[PDB]
A and B are shown apart, each in its own frame.
Chain A
Amino acid sequence: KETAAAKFERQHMDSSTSAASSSNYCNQMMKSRNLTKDRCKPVNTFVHESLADVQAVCSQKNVACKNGQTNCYQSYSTMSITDCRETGSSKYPNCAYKTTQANKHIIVACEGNPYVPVHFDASV
């Protein structure tokens, strides 16, 4: 039902902010985008840029992904990202996360046509 593109958007795109507002951003957002449904996703990253800017990363620096595939792309500029890490206290279904804001280059895995991001690989 949901496409790879769509999933990327849902899990990682939060254009409606320039940075995780409070310190309870991950808890609210992780839960509201269904990343805590079957279990607590250990780590997640949201990107606080426009869709267009993130989808343009597929045209930038071609890098190897972590799994070995070579269709990964690193952003020229640095972007506003929020690292969401699961605490120790967290336990399904009460998922607890620590919000860690940062500005780094995002590495994404791109595919399909239009050639859009389908997976968030790394931030560097």
Chain B
Amino acid sequence: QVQLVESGGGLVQAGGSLRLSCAASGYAYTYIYMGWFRQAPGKEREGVAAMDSGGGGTLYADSVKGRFTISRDKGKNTVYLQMDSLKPEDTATYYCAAGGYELRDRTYGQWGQGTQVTVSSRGR
């Protein structure tokens, strides 16, 4: 029984920041790859960012490059996602995942339960 617990979700204003946290509890070894996926309402789940257990084999989706930063405690089953300059487009439920490869959705067999991240427009 390995659980993947995520925290840090929230509701923010366009242009603000959030920090997502995920740790694997109960896993005896270290998952090589840990990453974040997200699913906007109705749409299909898409990969956001991923990093390996060493420094990193970091990879980012084209929509978040330069705004979001992923990080892992070297050698531990933890993944962080600093989300700066959030925009309406980023509104979605973010999922932490472990034990896969790069951003290949189908290769990940350990999935968090999801954290809602909602970013509200600046206008009205």
Contacts and interface: CB of A to CB of B under 8 A. Distances in A.
Interface stretch (A12-20, A30-38, A56-64): A56-64
Q: Main SS of the interface on chain B?
A: loop
Interface residues of B, number: 17
Interface stretch (A39-47, A79-87, A93-101, A110-118): A110-118
A75 to B, nearest CB: 13
B34 to A, nearest CB: 10
A71 B30 CA distance: 12
Contact of B101 (A59, A61, A71, A73): A71
A61 B32 CA distance: 10
Contacts of A112: 106
Given A59-B2, A70-B100, A111 B107 contact: yes
Contacts of B52: 70
Query: What size tier do the contact residues of chain A reach?
Result: 10 to 19
Contact of B31 (A62, A69, A111, A115): A62
B99 interface: yes
A63 B102 CA distance: 14
Contact of A69 (B28, B29, B30, B101): B101
A63 to B, nearest CB: 8
Interface of A: 58-59, 61-64, 69-71, 73, 110-113, 115
Listed from nearest, the 10 A-B pairs whose CB atoms lie closest are: A115-B109, A71-B107, A70-B32, A70-B101, A69-B101, A71-B101, A111-B106, A70-B33, A62-B99, A111-B107
